[PDB]
Amino acid sequence: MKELIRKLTEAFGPSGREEEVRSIILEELEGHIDGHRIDGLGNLIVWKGSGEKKVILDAHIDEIGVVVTNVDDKGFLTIEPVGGVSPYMLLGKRIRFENGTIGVVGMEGETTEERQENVRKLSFDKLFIDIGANSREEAQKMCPIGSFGVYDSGFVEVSGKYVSKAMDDRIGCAVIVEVFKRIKPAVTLYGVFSVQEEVGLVGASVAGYGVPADEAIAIDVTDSADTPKAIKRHAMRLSGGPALKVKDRASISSKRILENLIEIAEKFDIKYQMEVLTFGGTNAMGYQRTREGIPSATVSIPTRYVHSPSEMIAPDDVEATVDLLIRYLGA
Amino acid sequence: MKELIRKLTEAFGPSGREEEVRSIILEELEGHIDGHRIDGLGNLIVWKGSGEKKVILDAHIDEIGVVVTNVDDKGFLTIEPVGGVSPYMLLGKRIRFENGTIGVVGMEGETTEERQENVRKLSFDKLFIDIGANSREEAQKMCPIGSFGVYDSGFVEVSGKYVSKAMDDRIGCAVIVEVFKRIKPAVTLYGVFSVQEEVGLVGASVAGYGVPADEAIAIDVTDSADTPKAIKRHAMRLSGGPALKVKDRASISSKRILENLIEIAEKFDIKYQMEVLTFGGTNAMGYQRTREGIPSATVSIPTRYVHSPSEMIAPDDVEATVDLLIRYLGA
Amino acid sequence: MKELIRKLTEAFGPSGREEEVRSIILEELEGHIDGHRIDGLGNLIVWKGSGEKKVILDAHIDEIGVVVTNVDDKGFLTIEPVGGVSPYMLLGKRIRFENGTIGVVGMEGETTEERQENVRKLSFDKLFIDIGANSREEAQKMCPIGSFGVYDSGFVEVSGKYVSKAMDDRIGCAVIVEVFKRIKPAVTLYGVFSVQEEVGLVGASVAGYGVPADEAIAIDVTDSADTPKAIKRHAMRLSGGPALKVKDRASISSKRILENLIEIAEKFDIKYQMEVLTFGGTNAMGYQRTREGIPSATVSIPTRYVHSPSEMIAPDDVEATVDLLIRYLGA
Numbered sequence: 001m002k003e004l005i006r007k008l009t010e011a012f013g014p015s016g017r018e019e020e021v022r023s024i025i026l027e028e029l030e031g032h033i034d035g036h037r038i039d040g041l042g043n044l045i046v047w048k049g050s051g052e053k054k055v056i057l058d059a060h061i062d063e064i065g066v067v068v069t070n071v072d073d074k075g076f077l078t079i080e081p082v083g084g085v086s087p088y089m090l091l092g093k094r095i096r097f098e099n100g101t102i103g104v105v106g107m108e109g110e111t112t113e114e115r116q117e118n119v120r121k122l123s124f125d126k127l128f129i130d131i132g133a134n135s136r137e138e139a140q141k142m143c144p145i146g147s148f149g150v151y152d153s154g155f156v157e158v159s160g161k162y163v164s165k166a167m168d169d170r171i172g173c174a175v176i177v178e179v180f181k182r183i184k185p186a187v188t189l190y191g192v193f194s195v196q197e198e199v200g201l202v203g204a205s206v207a208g209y210g211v212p213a214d215e216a217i218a219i220d221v222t223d224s225a226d227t228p229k230a231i232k233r234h235a236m237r238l239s240g241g242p243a244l245k246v247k248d249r250a251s252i253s254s255k256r257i258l259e260n261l262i263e264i265a266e267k268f269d270i271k272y273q274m275e276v277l278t279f280g281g282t283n284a285m286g287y288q289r290t291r292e293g294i295p296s297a298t299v300s301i302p303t304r305y306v307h308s309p310s311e312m313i314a315p316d317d318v319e320a321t322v323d324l325l326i327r328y329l330g331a
Numbered sequence: 332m333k334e335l336i337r338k339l340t341e342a343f344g345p346s347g348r349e350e351e352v353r354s355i356i357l358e359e360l361e362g363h364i365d366g367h368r369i370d371g372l373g374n375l376i377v378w379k380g381s382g383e384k385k386v387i388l389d390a391h392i393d394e395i396g397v398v399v400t401n402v403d404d405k406g407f408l409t410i411e412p413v414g415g416v417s418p419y420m421l422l423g424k425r426i427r428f429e430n431g432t433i434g435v436v437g438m439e440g441e442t443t444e445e446r447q448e449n450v451r452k453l454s455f456d457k458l459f460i461d462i463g464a465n466s467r468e469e470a471q472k473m474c475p476i477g478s479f480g481v482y483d484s485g486f487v488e489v490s491g492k493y494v495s496k497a498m499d500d501r502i503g504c505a506v507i508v509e510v511f512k513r514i515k516p517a518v519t520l521y522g523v524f525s526v527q528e529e530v531g532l533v534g535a536s537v538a539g540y541g542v543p544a545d546e547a548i549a550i551d552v553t554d555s556a557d558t559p560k561a562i563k564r565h566a567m568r569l570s571g572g573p574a575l576k577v578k579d580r581a582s583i584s585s586k587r588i589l590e591n592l593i594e595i596a597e598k599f600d601i602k603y604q605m606e607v608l609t610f611g612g613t614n615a616m617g618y619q620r621t622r623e624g625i626p627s628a629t630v631s632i633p634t635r636y637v638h639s640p641s642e643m644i645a646p647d648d649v650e651a652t653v654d655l656l657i658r659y660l661g662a
Numbered sequence: 663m664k665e666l667i668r669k670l671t672e673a674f675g676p677s678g679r680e681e682e683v684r685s686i687i688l689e690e691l692e693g694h695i696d697g698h699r700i701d702g703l704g705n706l707i708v709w710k711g712s713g714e715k716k717v718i719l720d721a722h723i724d725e726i727g728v729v730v731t732n733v734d735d736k737g738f739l740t741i742e743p744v745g746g747v748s749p750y751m752l753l754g755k756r757i758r759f760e761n762g763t764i765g766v767v768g769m770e771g772e773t774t775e776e777r778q779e780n781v782r783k784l785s786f787d788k789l790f791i792d793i794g795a796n797s798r799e800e801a802q803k804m805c806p807i808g809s810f811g812v813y814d815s816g817f818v819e820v821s822g823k824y825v826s827k828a829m830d831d832r833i834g835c836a837v838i839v840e841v842f843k844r845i846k847p848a849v850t851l852y853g854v855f856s857v858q859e860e861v862g863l864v865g866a867s868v869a870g871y872g873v874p875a876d877e878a879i880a881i882d883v884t885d886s887a888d889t890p891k892a893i894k895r896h897a898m899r900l901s902g903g904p905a906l907k908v909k910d911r912a913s914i915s916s917k918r919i920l921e922n923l924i925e926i927a928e929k930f931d932i933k934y935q936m937e938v939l940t941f942g943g944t945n946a947m948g949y950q951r952t953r954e955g956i957p958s959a960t961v962s963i964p965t966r967y968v969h970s971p972s973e974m975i976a977p978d979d980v981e982a983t984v985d986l987l988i989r990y991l992g993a
């Protein structure tokens with residue numbers, strides 16, 4: 001699963017421009033699905049099996065990123081975040097744009113005091129991107145207004161942990177791909193690789209409309225609060241297993257689905273942990289609100305450094321999540 | 332109505348765990364409804380009558396509460412709010428958990444100065460719950476992560492006012508139950524006792540999907556701004572009658588429905604008042620946004636001390652609201 | 663001892679209005695004392711035994727509470743604390759008055775911003791009580807200026823701990839009652855159930871005047887600093903035994919009395935702990951200052967959440983305190 005995670009996390013797919021990730025997922029799934037379709041927003045919907053119970057597994061294919069909002073007379077670019085990227089994570093960083101351009105992020109400040117003030121209350125209004133242009137006309141040919149970019153950052157193994165950009169949520173995508181590669185479903189299994197989660201759960205608010213699901217399980221990251229002075233009210237930690245989300249700020253998981261998964265994990269000796277997240281949301285909200293309501297839950301991968309260019313997971317948690325879903329859904 | 336209000340407000344039903352309330356409502360409605368169903372999120376839908384016009388009356392069955400998010404080595408619990416609970420309403424209060432456990436809420440602060448600082452900017456990060464455990468393992472067996480709780484508070488009559496927890500929205504549940512118990516409907520009357528209003532209108536955003544309603548009327552509490560130095564821009568007061576909601580922050584009521592109700596009130600000499608609420612929302616928003624749009628309004632019970640353990644209503648307003656709905660919807 | 667603690671902690675007795683508590687104590691002591699008197703301030707003084715050494719055991723019968731200071735045109739009350747009640751412990755709470763009236767505590771604030779300002783610097787000037795009255799005349803008939811109240815809160819066992827209002831100092835009263843029920847005194851034992859400790863040690867500043875005591879031991883609560891981020895400079899804890907008070911802000915205990923009790927505890931294998939308290943005072947100061955000076959000490963019950971409606975003690979500490987006093991004073 002290491003090379004699948006490397007390929008998915010390094011692929012380009014900020015919210016709204018997820019094509020490249022979608023096509024990689026399809027190539028990994030061919031031979032392991034019975035059919036697929038792509039809807040009008042770009043959600044990829046795959047299926048395997050013909051059981052009477054119908055289940056969605058959802059992971060989002062978009063990552064946070066930036067979009068160019070303006071260009072000045074010297075060729076520098078101004079940007080707007082795409083999803084929840086902190087300007088502090090961009091200082092001194094490089095951005096890779098959809099067309100392959102690399103840009104360097106710099107900060108304004110006409111005096112040393114101004115620079116101190118700006119970093120104290122950093123905002124995207126004080127950042128700019130340098131793509132090497134020498135004029136506005138040159139920059140507009142290179143990377144015009146509306147161009148999307150992501151962190152220029154890739155995958156590395158760090159003493160047994162995996163680190164990359166976009167673990168949120170290419171790690172959930174990898175989980176679902178591996179489930180389809182291995183499972184003999186007892187259900188009709190739908191895999192939804194949904195768009196634009198980071199800008200408001202857009203894809204998953206419609207992807208279930210045309211899927212006759214009885215249940216929906218979102219796979220996403222959660223806060224691994226096991227670093228120095230981490231968030232004290234979060235219990236989730238690396239190597240504690242899949243985290244069964246009781247609640248975050250966007251949904252309360254179905255009690256029945258959580259109980260089913262707890263029963264599966266205890267029966268098959270899969271380590272797991274319970275999750276309450278005090279901020280944030282996942283695509284389970286979109287399925288709950290679809291049509292007459294699809295009962296939904298989230299199973300989370302504990303992740304350190306979420307929304308940074310160096311998100312970190314423990315591979316044993318990812319393998320245990322795959323095992324849990326196969327045991328819950330497979331024949 | 333008094334014993335119905337006592338039973339409903341004292342029942343256990345924080346958002347996501349409303350089963351106890353749903354079951355009491357079904358028992359009270361036996362002999363007064365033509366049929367019912369429970370959907371996949373837990374919304375209870377009941378119906379009576381067969382008229383051409385189809386009307387939903389909605390009340391939410393959830394109350395605000397707390398959920399356990401972590402446990403420390405000495406057996407103390409940390410919590411997260413479920414809905415809009417202020418940490419100031421929890422200090423020195425007791426919490427009743429689903430499994431019957433009682434816990435005492437305490438506040439951190441290693442010096443007298445830290446305690447003063449903490450109460451000035453109180454947050455859930457500075458609260459803990461003591462359930463009498465002496466270790467992490469004892470507490471995990473007693474009240475683990477993901478356990479839900481509500482105020483340990485019950486019903487009392489205060490010189491002719493009624494005071495309890497969860498008037499929001501067990502008083503609206505009581506209104507609708509009493510309408511079904513009394514009414515000979517001229518409409519097809521659907522009663523929706525919906526889940527998870529306090530965590531984002533979840534239940535009512537789907538309960539209408541499978542109900543062919545021409546109108547929906549939510550019954551919920553509103554701010555009785557008749558206490559000392561109450562919110563000056565709110566006009567609503569106890570004993571002013573049902574409050575007809577023109578607007579709050581989640582919906583504008585249908586003008587036609589409001590006009591219909593005003594006509595009924597004037598024809599039958601029912602006291603009523605108009606409402607504009609400068610914060611907050613109700614399930615009318617969910618029905619308005621269902622399918623091609625269900626025209627919706629809210630009729631509110633004036634309530635003092637909303638989201639405290641001592642919410643207060645005037646029984647005459649409750650009786651007038653029942654009268655208004657029976658006159659509007661009955662033969 | 664459980665039912666005695668339940669009855670004493672639930673009884674009504676704010677400072678100045680302790681009659682009901684005094685009457686319960688006198689009834690419990692019937693058959694176990696040789697005589698008693700009630701002095702002009704209301705202190706109850708009892709005695710048993712005939713030995714040469716005369717020892718006072720003191721506990722105060724008052725608890726903190728509130729008193730009505732004014733009534734407005736709409737029947738709402740304003741209050742003043744009786745003793746050290748924090749306004750933060752009153753928000754959303756109910757008050758039980760001497761005549762049985764229940765009132766609900768609310769807070770002023772004409773805008774959402776004013777409400778936020780008010781809770782950041784809460785004072786009794788921003789609180790009011792609602793007793794259900796609709797006019798000043800009605801409220802003055804129900805609960806006029808000068809009416810006293812206490813928390814509407816009662817006793818509950820929480821996994822082997824006892825929780826109630828007024829552990830301070832009904833637990834000390836229970837200790838001394840149980841000593842008198844069991845002891846065969848080697849001293850002449852005087853029991854003083856003093857009034858008005860919480861408003862300045864008033865009762866115990868005079869109850870010793872007419873008692874020819876050689877020693878005085880006050881029994882009162884102290885801070886059990888074993889909760890999350892408790893007061894770091896307090897060592898006392900639940901289940902560490904009676905706490906022998908070296909000093910607090912009102913007195914330094916007699917070194918000879920503390921040494922006597924330590925010798926007893928070691929001889930009879932009774933668990934105990936030493937106390938230094940960085941704020942607060944007890945009735946030991948009143949006996950120390952009586953006439954030519956009565957050597958005095960305090961033995962404290964570790965208590966969590968002091969001056970809240972949910973004070974918490976460990977029953978084993980209370981039993982050990984009774985044992986200690988019987989071994990020290992009895993045949």
Ligand SMILES: [Co+2]
Nearest residue numbers: 064168198307
């Ligand atoms: Co994200």
Ligand SMILES: [Co+2]
Nearest residue numbers: 395499529638
């Ligand atoms: Co509410």
Ligand SMILES: [Co+2]
Nearest residue numbers: 726830860969
């Ligand atoms: Co005190």
Ligand SMILES: [O-]
Nearest residue numbers: 168220221281
């Ligand atoms: O996310």
Ligand SMILES: [Zn+2]
Nearest residue numbers: 168169220221
């Ligand atoms: Zn995500």
Ligand SMILES: [Zn+2]
Nearest residue numbers: 499500551552
């Ligand atoms: Zn409500």
Ligand SMILES: [Zn+2]
Nearest residue numbers: 830831882883
């Ligand atoms: Zn005391």
